[PDB]
Design a protein around this ligand. Sequence first.
Ligand SMILES: [Mn+2]
Ligand SMILES: [Mn+2]
Ligand SMILES: [Mn+2]
Ligand SMILES: [Mn+2]
Lengths: 334, 336, 334, 335
Amino acid sequence: KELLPPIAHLYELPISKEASGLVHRTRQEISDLVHGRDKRLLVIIGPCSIHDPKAALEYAERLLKLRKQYENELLIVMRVYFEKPRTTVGWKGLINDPHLDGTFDINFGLSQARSLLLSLNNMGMPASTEFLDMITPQYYADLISWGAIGARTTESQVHRELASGLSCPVGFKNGTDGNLKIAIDAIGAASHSHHFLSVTKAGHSAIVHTGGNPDCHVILRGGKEPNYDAEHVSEAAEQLRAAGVTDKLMIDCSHANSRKDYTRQMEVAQDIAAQLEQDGGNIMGVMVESHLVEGRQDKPEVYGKSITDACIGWGATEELLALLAGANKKRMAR
Amino acid sequence: VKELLPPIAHLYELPISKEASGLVHRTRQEISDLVHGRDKRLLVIIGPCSIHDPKAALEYAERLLKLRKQYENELLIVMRVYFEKPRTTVGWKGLINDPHLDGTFDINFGLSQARSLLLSLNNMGMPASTEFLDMITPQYYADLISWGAIGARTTESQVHRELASGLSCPVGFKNGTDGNLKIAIDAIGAASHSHHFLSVTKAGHSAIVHTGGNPDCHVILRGGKEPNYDAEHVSEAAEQLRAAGVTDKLMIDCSHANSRKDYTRQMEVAQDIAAQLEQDGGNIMGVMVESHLVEGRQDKPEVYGKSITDACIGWGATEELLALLAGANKKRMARA
Amino acid sequence: KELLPPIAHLYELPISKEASGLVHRTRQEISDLVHGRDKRLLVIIGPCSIHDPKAALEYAERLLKLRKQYENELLIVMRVYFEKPRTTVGWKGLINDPHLDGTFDINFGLSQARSLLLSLNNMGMPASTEFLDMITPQYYADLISWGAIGARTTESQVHRELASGLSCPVGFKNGTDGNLKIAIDAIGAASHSHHFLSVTKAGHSAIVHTGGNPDCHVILRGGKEPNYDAEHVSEAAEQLRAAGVTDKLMIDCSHANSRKDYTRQMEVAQDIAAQLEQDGGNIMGVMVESHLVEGRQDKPEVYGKSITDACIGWGATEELLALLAGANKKRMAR
Amino acid sequence: VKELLPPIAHLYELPISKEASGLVHRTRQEISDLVHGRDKRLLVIIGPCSIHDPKAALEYAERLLKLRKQYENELLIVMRVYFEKPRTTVGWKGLINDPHLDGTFDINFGLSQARSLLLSLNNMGMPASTEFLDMITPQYYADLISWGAIGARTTESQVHRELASGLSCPVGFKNGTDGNLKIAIDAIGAASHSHHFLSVTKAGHSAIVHTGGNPDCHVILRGGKEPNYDAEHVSEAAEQLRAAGVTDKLMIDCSHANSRKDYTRQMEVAQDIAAQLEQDGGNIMGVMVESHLVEGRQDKPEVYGKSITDACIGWGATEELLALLAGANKKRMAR
Ligand SMILES: [Mn+2]
Ligand SMILES: [Mn+2]
Ligand SMILES: [Mn+2]
Ligand SMILES: [Mn+2]
């Protein structure tokens, strides 16, 4: 029944020295990308949502080899998303409903999330997630190397407040109809200090005073129309410069950029590869929804197959990563 | 720097009176009736963009109470008592977050002052409305609120739909800042359902909460890239509302993007609404107006009764605007 | 550094159906002794203090064989004391300092105590302890079948309040100089309802309203002089009746009744044996300090040997239990 | 059924003033000076057995303040402001536990009232003392306390010795209800050391605390089966204290078992103490007296300024008793 406070989980599942070092390092490297110091491509890649730790670990084992192999061209970090914003109602992810049956066993959800994150980081795979809920971060944020604020929450002051106090770099998605300005505004908000109410590690509400997050950037995830091409990127960088914030940005191959057709993710990646070969100087990253098995399913019957947005399968993932590595290797050669 | 006192500290210093409790209960029911088309009085959510001075707020409430009473057969008047302001980037977030208006963020003081003003307003017979922006502050005052808003910038946010699903007052969801109505329709859907999520108890500890859903949600047309207040936008919205199986009674904001952020054009929007109410106006249950003692705005809190956030109409024009709506709705209610 | 609330421990170490039922039946069975509805003799027996779980489990397994053997004559419940009152300063028990080295790892101490109690009840051995601290009981009282309030705290209003809200029977010891009245007064006070501050399972202070504890009794543990003989028992019983409370009592064979000399416990047990054969109608229980190996030691060097008060070893334990079982079989047959 | 407000609720409504903090700091230091033989003024813990009416307590404090000033070179006068009462069995546990005196246990109001009264006392220039009975309540007002007692019924209790080890005021431990002095000497030992134990924070959450030990503890002679205030008893206690390596400055209660539970005998005891101070009295650092505006006791709070717990001397006898002790100690100090 009762909610265990973060300290209960931190006590049982303390961050290892390995996990700690991988997080600190990956955050700094990503920061270097955000601010143009390094020209590797951040690739945020993996399932739309985590519903099975076993499949997640297997996926991570395969992805780790590509992370190492392409480490001079790409900085691979896995999607380990525990919180899903629904259009109306639906399963909100492993934390809110881990047994996938409407039992809402949130204590078990948080434990499993933390434990998965700990295991990923211990094997050498850094993790990313969307920070949707205001209280759950205390349970796992120490294990996160990069955070997203979703299209649906980028304009929300309470999420900009949250981002302002997070220790990892944060990407803000443009709004669901394509509005980029709200994400530029969000970087501005989140880079400043805020005072607001939040929950401590002991589970009590408190006034927090944050320092601001210097490592925020935008993510182009499509709108009414896709926004991944060179023209959309150029216009975005112009707007970012006029706002006085970093003009290095991330492109989501999924969602409104593939128009909900997982087979178009490769096409968006190819367009990005062509940008990187021609110039692509404003691109610091890409996002990809990828799993062991392609497509999606309503019920969790098939192993390693998404129960939220459809993903590319492992084979296409190998091709997509090869494609970006080769292209960015050329960008970095200039 | 002081730790956060829990809701119980304030609830105990400032308990709700039987009178305030009765006003809130009754006003929420009356509003539910408007939202579901059972009564044809027009809800008018009117008053300052933000509260920054309780004294001016109380004087405003005294003048407004006279009109609330005068027009009570035509209009259901509820004061805007907004304590939480969503900024485009950065800026003063309202009385709770920064009550001394100087960047000292004395939230404990902000919370008691908000609760105390709300209790005084209800005790004088003036019900209160606010935008629920923050996730943890509502436990401190929600017992004193008769109608709530979820702002344009948060209607699409799952955590705000969650919050709404657990509120005991009717809730209006604004269309998005670029005009997207579908998100507010989706929000009614979400907020009408039960949710499980994390929240904070009255003792100040985090907990898992399980809400029952809010059956009294509606949309608010507040403009986008173009205004959306006219008969054609109302008609299109009503269609979409019916297609989604939710109430097709809606509220129209005369301010913000519908006035094009020009306080002098609220009356223009109100005239258009008045005309709709006289011709038909059957899908309109409410209106929103940004009004203060004195018109305009000011960067610093120098002038008494003048907004430090969005520019408002002043008292004289408020009288005219309200008389306009009362007269027009009298006609609508008289029609066979 | 931060104290985990009881709920953290109750979540990791939930009580089993078996342990739950054992605790429930044992409390019931013991209430029947307290109020004179059954004439079996409660025997609270085991180490002065628990300092090693392994030895506690070995002891328990031997004690279980005798609990079964003597179940028609004796109700055997193990001493599992985790909190020790010191005359001045010293080791306060396994909870306060579980590593025995002055590190005070109280979180570990509490989980270790809870886990031991869970294993004991799961093997069929009910447990008893002294409730000394106001905050720790919430972490394990669900696993306790009988509780003591010590000689040094029986007169304390806060301990009487505590006893008033526990769900197990509770014995109050006469005071360290031999005062019986403070224990009689304690039963009165603890049987009534109290309002006082206590800490919830979530770790927050609260006002609790107890219903009172109707299963309290006195324990004769000696004073300036021993108080175990039939003369002292008779005088205690008259005073008990005069206060309107149960005149069934428990006798400690240890502490000041043995003059702090562990061999003398058997002398006291023999004397009680004589009483149960003659009559002994006011006796409902005895307490005995017993370990695998006899004596004491300042350092935990020898396995199964006390580091607090000296205990009788297993050999003598067998003889003491045989003696009481045989004597009480005769009492019960009358 | 209200929930318990945490100490920060009351601290932010009733913050300690500069003047009150100053008086508390000074008084604790001054008493420490007595405990450790740097000053020879006599600490006098004097006032009602229990506080049950703030109006009467404030009137009493105003009278006592005049005397605190008059005798300040001889006596260090501190008011008894006892909020927590240990009962033999059942009964009214005090103003905190039951402030409306009717079994409604309105503990939030009780704590507020206690804190408010203590704040006003310190603000008028009168330092306050109390018995610390409960493990959770001290956080609400300990900052306003200049001297604390651990009662005879808890001096042997480990949880109370732990509490004492973390308090920032001097603490007196009473001998046992039957006359045992060893338990109080043992308690000073225990309380002088660092402890790790569970306690509650200002925010209302349980926590492990690590105390630094209380170097300012001393014993209180309060009688047992027989009274223990005379020179022979003082001398025997002093020897035992020196044998245990702890301060041999002690306090003598004129009330309770040393007066054989009879309020008219408190003067008898103070007379005896007065002669000890004139002859020698080098081990006596203080005394306790149960005093109110009007003498006696009463079961119902009918008469203003009259005890409803133990019987007290009235204001007239209080003036005489304090004159006595001041006169006698003036001579001790001059030797
Ligand atoms: Mn997705
Ligand atoms: Mn506004
Ligand atoms: Mn022992
Ligand atoms: Mn008294």
